[PDB]
Write an enzyme that holds these catalytic residues in place. Structure first.
Site, PDB file in Angstrom:
ATOM      1  N   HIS A 176       0.864  -1.180   0.000  1.00 14.44           N
ATOM      2  CA  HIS A 176       0.000   0.000   0.000  1.00 14.44           C
ATOM      3  C   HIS A 176       0.899   1.227   0.000  1.00 14.44           C
ATOM      4  O   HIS A 176       1.409   1.634   1.048  1.00 14.44           O
ATOM      5  CB  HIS A 176      -0.933   0.010   1.206  1.00 14.44           C
ATOM      6  CG  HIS A 176      -2.015   1.053   1.140  1.00 14.44           C
ATOM      7  ND1 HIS A 176      -1.922   2.190   0.365  1.00 14.44           N
ATOM      8  CD2 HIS A 176      -3.206   1.134   1.781  1.00 14.44           C
ATOM      9  CE1 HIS A 176      -3.014   2.918   0.518  1.00 14.44           C
ATOM     10  NE2 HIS A 176      -3.809   2.300   1.377  1.00 14.44           N
ATOM     11  N   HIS A 179      -2.736   6.925  -1.261  1.00 17.00           N
ATOM     12  CA  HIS A 179      -3.777   7.560  -0.449  1.00 17.00           C
ATOM     13  C   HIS A 179      -3.238   8.313   0.764  1.00 17.00           C
ATOM     14  O   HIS A 179      -3.947   8.473   1.759  1.00 17.00           O
ATOM     15  CB  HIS A 179      -4.826   6.532  -0.015  1.00 17.00           C
ATOM     16  CG  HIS A 179      -5.417   5.779  -1.166  1.00 17.00           C
ATOM     17  ND1 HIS A 179      -5.920   4.502  -1.046  1.00 17.00           N
ATOM     18  CD2 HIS A 179      -5.548   6.116  -2.472  1.00 17.00           C
ATOM     19  CE1 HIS A 179      -6.364   4.095  -2.223  1.00 17.00           C
ATOM     20  NE2 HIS A 179      -6.141   5.052  -3.108  1.00 17.00           N
ATOM     21  N   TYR A 181      -0.753   7.677   2.911  1.00 21.93           N
ATOM     22  CA  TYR A 181      -0.248   6.934   4.056  1.00 21.93           C
ATOM     23  C   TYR A 181       1.284   6.964   4.020  1.00 21.93           C
ATOM     24  O   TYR A 181       1.871   7.806   3.331  1.00 21.93           O
ATOM     25  CB  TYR A 181      -0.902   5.551   4.064  1.00 21.93           C
ATOM     26  CG  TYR A 181      -2.394   5.683   4.324  1.00 21.93           C
ATOM     27  CD1 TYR A 181      -2.857   6.157   5.554  1.00 21.93           C
ATOM     28  CD2 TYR A 181      -3.335   5.381   3.339  1.00 21.93           C
ATOM     29  CE1 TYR A 181      -4.211   6.303   5.814  1.00 21.93           C
ATOM     30  CE2 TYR A 181      -4.704   5.520   3.594  1.00 21.93           C
ATOM     31  CZ  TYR A 181      -5.131   5.988   4.827  1.00 21.93           C
ATOM     32  OH  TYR A 181      -6.478   6.136   5.087  1.00 21.93           O
TER      33      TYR A 181
END
Ligand code: WI6
Ligand code: FMN
Length: 364
Positions: A176, A179, A181
């Site tokens: 990930h 977004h 993060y």
């Protein structure tokens, strides 16, 4: 319907191109994967379909939502195995998304109430609020900027978590890096104010995601590693002055990792802002796809019509769906039959009930 032409993703012979996008649902009570996750993923599993899990903690300091699963303890590994087994019995492929939120956290989610870590000491501004365990919303606090040694420690947390996912039987992991993060906090020049080797130039801002990907590739093999980025999504004050350039810079690094390792990644997965997909009913997603040497998954506001067009036009090999897949367990079949789609209820996106708003959306 080109969404149902078979696609070979490395060793996996996918029977269709409709992918379950990773979504946090907060049903993994106290970070332990629960039986409810098993039912939820089983409902959505299809023979030859690809599933990506909700973002999953890589360490005790990586969480910024309540009751998100971890994969950094052997206990968590044990519970994940039962979920993976049920999905595999339906013939699906499933990757575990490895998620560190960085500064997008709160004292309530941190061991001993410590500060969240980040590339920077700048907090997310007050125009974003964090969901708290009691369902209210709180203030994002000031993060602690980590040094190079600690960066290597976070990289090792990704590596250990990737090994744990393979131990649990996952077919692979997804990094990930989107977004707003932790990885995005190093990528985006609206956040990365560092003056050391991890800040400034495009090469320096790409260092952290490169080290993370390289570490997991060397642990489990490039074929079992997917990477997710969102250069044009500004979620949580994560803006870049040149999203196209930043995205191409990342793709540049992934292509070279593949050349050096001697093997292609599972895929590159890119999310676009939802307003882009609404306008398609832009060239950014196609530009990254054209530059990346391998499998490309598009995401962000896709519909049946936009998904068909993406694959037919060559904009992507696979299309991942989020919100429609929350409310449509059999989304794949509804798309195949062009059937009506259940509306989704945002109020139960992040609640803790193992059934309500989670597994009680009806099948066709
Ligand atoms: N990556 C994650 O963990 C997701 C957590 C929350 C929502 N995700 C993404 O953030 C962006 C804004 O989410 P939304 O509009 O739901 O805002 P919230 O802060 O959830 O209210 C969208 O691209 C959405 O797909 C990201
Ligand atoms: C409730 C919810 C939770 C999400 N959780 C994650 C997540 O954990 N990791 C991630 O990379 N994206 C997450 N996303 C973004 C989705 O993976 C996906 O990019 C987005 O939902 C696609 O747009 P769509 O809903 O129009 O299909 C989440 C989205 C929603 C609505």
């Amino acid at each position: 319907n080109p969404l149902f032409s078979p696609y070979k993703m490395g060793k996996f012979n996918l029977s269709h191109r409709v992918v379950l996008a990773p979504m946090t649902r907060c049903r993994a009570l106290n970070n332990i994967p629960q039986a409810a996750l098993g039912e939820y993923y089983e409902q959505r599993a299809t023979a030859g379909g690809f599933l990506i899990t909700e973002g999953t903690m890589i360490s005790p300091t990586s969480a910024g939502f309540p009751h998100v699963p971890g994969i950094f303890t052997k206990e968590q590994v044990r519970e994940w195995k039962k979920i993976v087994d049920v999905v595999h019995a339906k013939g699906a492929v499933i990757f575990c998304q490895l998620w560190h939120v960085g500064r997008a956290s709160h004292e309530v989610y941190q061991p001993a109430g410590a500060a969240p870590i980040s590339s920077t000491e700048k907090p997310i501004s007050n125009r974003w609020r964090i969901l708290m365990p009691d369902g209210t919303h709180g203030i994002y606090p000031k993060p602690r900027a980590i040094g190079t040694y600690e960066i290597s420690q976070v990289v090792e947390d990704y590596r250990r978590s990737a090994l744990n996912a393979i131990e649990a039987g996952f077919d692979g992991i997804e990094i990930h890096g989107a977004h707003g993060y932790l990885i995005d906090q190093f990528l985006k020049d609206g956040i990365n104010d560092r003056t050391d080797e991890y800040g400034g130039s495009l090469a320096n801002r790409c260092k952290f995601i490169t080290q993370v990907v390289q570490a997991v590739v060397s642990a489990i093999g490039a074929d079992r590693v997917g990477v997710r980025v969102s250069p044009a999504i500004d979620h949580l004050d994560a803006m870049d002055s040149n999203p196209l350039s930043l995205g191409l810079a990342v793709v540049e690094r992934l292509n070279k990792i593949q050349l050096h390792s001697g093997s292609k990644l599972a895929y590159l997965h890119v999310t676009q802002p939802r307003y882009v997909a609404y306008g398609q009913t832009a060239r950014l997603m196609r530009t990254l796809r054209n530059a990346y040497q391998g499998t490309f998954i598009c995401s962000g506001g896709y519909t049946r019509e936009l998904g068909i067009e993406a694959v037919a036009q060559g904009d992507a090999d696979l299309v991942s769906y989020g919100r429609l897949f929350i409310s449509n367990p059999d989304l794949v079949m509804r798309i195949k039959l062009n059937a009506p789609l259940n509306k989704y209820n945002r109020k139960t996106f992040y609640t803790q009930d193992p059934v309500v708003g989670y597994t009680d959306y009806p099948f066709l």
